[PDB]
Amino acid sequence: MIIGNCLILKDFSSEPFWGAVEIENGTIKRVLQGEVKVDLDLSGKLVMPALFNTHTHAPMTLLRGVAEDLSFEEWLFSKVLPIEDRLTEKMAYYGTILAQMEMARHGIAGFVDMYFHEEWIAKAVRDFGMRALLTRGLVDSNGDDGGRLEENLKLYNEWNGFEGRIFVGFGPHSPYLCSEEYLKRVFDTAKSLNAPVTIHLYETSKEEYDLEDILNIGLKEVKTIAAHCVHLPERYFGVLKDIPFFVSHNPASNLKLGNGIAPVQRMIEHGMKVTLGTDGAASNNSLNLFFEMRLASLLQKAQNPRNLDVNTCLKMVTYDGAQAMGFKSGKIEEGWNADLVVIDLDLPEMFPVQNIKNHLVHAFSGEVFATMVAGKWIYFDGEYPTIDSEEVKRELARIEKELY
Numbered sequence: 001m002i003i004g005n006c007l008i009l010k011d012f013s014s015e016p017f018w019g020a021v022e023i024e025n026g027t028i029k030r031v032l033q034g035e036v037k038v039d040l041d042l043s044g045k046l047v048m049p050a051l052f053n054t055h056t057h058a059p060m061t062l063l064r065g066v067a068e069d070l071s072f073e074e075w076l077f078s079k080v081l082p083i084e085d086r087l088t089e090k091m092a093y094y095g096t097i098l099a100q101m102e103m104a105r106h107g108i109a110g111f112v113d114m115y116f117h118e119e120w121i122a123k124a125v126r127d128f129g130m131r132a133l134l135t136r137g138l139v140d141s142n143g144d145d146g147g148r149l150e151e152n153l154k155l156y157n158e159w160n161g162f163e164g165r166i167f168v169g170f171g172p173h174s175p176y177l178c179s180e181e182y183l184k185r186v187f188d189t190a191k192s193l194n195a196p197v198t199i200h201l202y203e204t205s206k207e208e209y210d211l212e213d214i215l216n217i218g219l220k221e222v223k224t225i226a227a228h229c230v231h232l233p234e235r236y237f238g239v240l241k242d243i244p245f246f247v248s249h250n251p252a253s254n255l256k257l258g259n260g261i262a263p264v265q266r267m268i269e270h271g272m273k274v275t276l277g278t279d280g281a282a283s284n285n286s287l288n289l290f291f292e293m294r295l296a297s298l299l300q301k302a303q304n305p306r307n308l309d310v311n312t313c314l315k316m317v318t319y320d321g322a323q324a325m326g327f328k329s330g331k332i333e334e335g336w337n338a339d340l341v342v343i344d345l346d347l348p349e350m351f352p353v354q355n356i357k358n359h360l361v362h363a364f365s366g367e368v369f370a371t372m373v374a375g376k377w378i379y380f381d382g383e384y385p386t387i388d389s390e391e392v393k394r395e396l397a398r399i400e401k402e403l404y
């Protein structure tokens, strides 16, 4: 298949050019320049690498807007947890289908999850078409984790590697919901399977523990996606530079729950790898990485308008995200995955045409035209080709009634 005859943004550091792309068996076979015979003419649009959301809680789409005007502790222990006790396996599946519908209309190809009923979440990702690094949220009480780590291993056993689209990791919630001993066990497990770890790190100001207790139990050796890092002491930026440590920046969530602004510019200048996550729909409340990217840039610019320039931003949502997720995506080059998104250039916000890249970061709403994952269209002109929209919608309607 060859799509094109339009502008093509190869990667974050290059400029658009008129051409086309040939996809074959979920990969990029070749990138053509100039005019050429295409099977799909996307003239008047832009083709670029798809985006990768490095942090979310998929089924929380079912709780969108249910927890407003609350401090962090109230939000989680008073509002969210009681509702989650009522969230079923079936709801996890449909909440994830909904989450993918939303992420897909925003050009997202893959996401990193941390939740429960994870196998049902995996089924939903299987059916929808996206890529995902799935992990089970882990917490313990003096070593007793209620069988959560075991569930994570079951998930690993049954889903790691599925169709090259799904990978399984471990999700210890945070250094405060996980005891020191339990955390070491989780890191040792991940270390043994050579699997990633995702954890909420220094999300709130109350967290003042030393990163040393983690740096010497596996962090230096385990690929880790640390969400938030709002209060990560700057004295550690140096050491985090050369280990597979990926910060997942979640600007909207940090602001909405009154946690603050992470010094991303500083982290980046110190050589740290930084990616973008949306977190869950109950504390965002959208699953839009374009919005997240724009917001991130603005927040850093408040300190210095030169902070988080356009290319650095595009790199963060595309290539860096794919890297944290272990997928060879993020660039339209031969041999790379065919994970692409199509943006409509025939819009007010995309003018002047000579500044398209800037528009992508500071003016575009995030509503893409189509999104392709593994060579398949998972969203196209308002349509969801991989699912029965109407059926899914009815189920969600029943779930809303049942859940609330």
Ligand SMILES: N[C@@H](CCSC[C@H]1O[C@@H](n2cnc3c(=O)[nH]cnc32)[C@H](O)[C@@H]1O)C(=O)O
Pocket: 057, 076, 080, 081, 084, 114, 115, 116, 136, 137, 138, 139, 148, 173, 200, 203, 253, 257, 279, 280, 283
């Ligand atoms: N509560 C789960 C274990 C953690 S799953 C991942 C958890 O992260 C929670 N979560 C969602 N958003 C945030 C956030 O912004 N900060 C901290 N935790 C969050 C989410 O509600 C979920 O409970 C259980 O009992 O098995």
Ligand SMILES: [Zn+2]
Pocket: 055, 056, 057, 200, 227, 279, 280
């Ligand atoms: Zn989170």
